[PDB]
């Protein structure tokens, strides 16, 4: 399974309501990830979470949301007939995020504290790399030249 997430499931026949919380005290905005399992059938949900009518509540100082699982057979992508809806938010410093759930939560195991930076960015390409160094970079290749254009 994913490494930065956690697929909670009941134990000893229980999925006791959980209320875990996190307070961003890292002085940097924190990227939080989570997920909701929309299983393919009601028996699967009853098995994983031992409830037919589960919910997932995610709250913060501004962010408030509630997810109900949608149970349905679906096309069998990657041999899987269920789904996971992936959600995220940037919990700002001092803000507290609360997860509540009686099931269907793919909780976070790891999050990310972000350090913003100008000049960086995302480049879509398949070009190779060497340990060359450059001043400029482009998806087809780097640029090492004095010209303006």
């Amino acid at each position, epitope marked *: 399974f994913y490494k930065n997430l956690l697929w909670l*499931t*009941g*134990k*000893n*026949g*229980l999925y006791p309501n959980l209320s875990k919380s996190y307070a961003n005290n890292k002085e940097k905005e924190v990227l939080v990830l989570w997920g909701v399992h929309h299983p*393919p*059938n*009601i*028996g*699967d949900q*009853r*098995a*994983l*979470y*031992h*409830t*037919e009518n589960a919910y997932v509540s995610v709250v913060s100082s501004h962010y408030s949301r509630k997810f109900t699982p949608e149970i349905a057979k679906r096309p069998k992508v990657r041999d899987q007939e269920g789904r996971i809806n992936y959600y995220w938010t940037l919990l700002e410093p001092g803000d507290t995020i609360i997860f509540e759930a009686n099931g269907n939560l793919i909780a976070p195991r790891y999050a990310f504290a972000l350090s913003r930076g100008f000049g960086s960015g995302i480049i879509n390409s398949n070009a190779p790399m060497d340990e060359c160094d450059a001043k400029c970079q482009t998806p087809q290749g780097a640029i090492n030249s004095s010209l303006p254009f």
Partner: antibody, heavy 121, light 112 residues
Framework: QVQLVQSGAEVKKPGASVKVSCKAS????????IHWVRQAPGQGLEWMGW????????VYAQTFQARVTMTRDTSISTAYMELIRLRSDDTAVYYC??????????????WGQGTLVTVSG | DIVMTQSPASLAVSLGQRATISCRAS??????????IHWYQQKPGQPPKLLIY???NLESGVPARFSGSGSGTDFTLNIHPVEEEDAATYYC?????????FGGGTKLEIKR
């Protein structure tokens, strides 16, 4: 004593409909789901569906979705399976089963005596 | 749809020996810390009666001759010592997902 007791055996004409009953005793009827199972004569078991007697909600198997109707009277802690448009291959022993526990998809531990429904002209 | 293949279709065992009925699923029935197999015993003319649930947990009132083993997709019902009272049909079943599907059956015969 905990138990489920089912309506006696019966016959029905093809194209007709049958109502089987499962009266519970000795336990809180609403807390434990109730499934209905059938076993063709000399054949193996096959599972029809369940009803949540607390809510009256139901799930049925696809090969039984169109024709089965599970219900419950909670006043007398009783469940009903209605099968319509009977075909001959629906002759079988129909059992009412109760789950061993709540919430988790545990097994069936209480069963009914079995009601023999015979379908032929 | 999870299919419970079950084997062998019949056993010929003698009193005091060990009977091993092997059930397999088309897909894992294990999660929630549980394996959602259940083994039932049906003698002729009777309803089934639950032997073990969740593939390992012997039910109350059941003799200890019965034992459940296995996980994931492969599970086993071990009877020892076999006895006259164990002449019956033994069914796999899974509660993992719908539809709850049985295994087809395994008759058991006292070998003589």
């Amino acid at each position: 004593q905990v138990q489920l007791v089912q309506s006696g055996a019966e016959v029905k004409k093809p194209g007709a409909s049958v109502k089987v009953s499962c009266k519970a005793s000795g336990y809180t009827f609403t807390g434990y789901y109730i499934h209905w199972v059938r076993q063709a004569p000399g054949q193996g078991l096959e599972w029809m569906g369940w009803i949540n007697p607390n809510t009256g909600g139901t799930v049925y198997a696809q090969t039984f979705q169109a024709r089965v109707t599970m219900t419950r009277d909670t006043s007398i802690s009783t469940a009903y399976m209605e099968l319509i448009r009977l075909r001959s291959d629906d002759t079988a022993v129909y059992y009412c089963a109760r789950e061993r526990g709540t919430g988790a998809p545990d097994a069936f531990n209480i069963w009914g005596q079995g009601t023999l429904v015979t379908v032929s002209g | 749809d999870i299919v419970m293949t079950q084997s062998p279709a019949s056993l010929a065992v003698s009193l005091g020996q060990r009977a091993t009925i092997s059930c397999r699923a088309s897909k894992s029935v294990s999660t929630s810390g549980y394996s959602y197999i259940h083994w039932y015993q049906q003698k002729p003319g009777q309803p089934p009666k639950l032997l073990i649930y969740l593939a390992t947990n012997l039910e109350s009132g059941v003799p200890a001759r019965f034992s459940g083993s296995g996980s994931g997709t492969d599970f086993t019902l071990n009877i020892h010592p076999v006895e006259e009272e164990d002449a019956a049909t033994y069914y796999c079943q899974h509660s993992r997902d719908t539809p709850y599907t049985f295994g087809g059956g395994t008759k058991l015969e006292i070998k003589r």
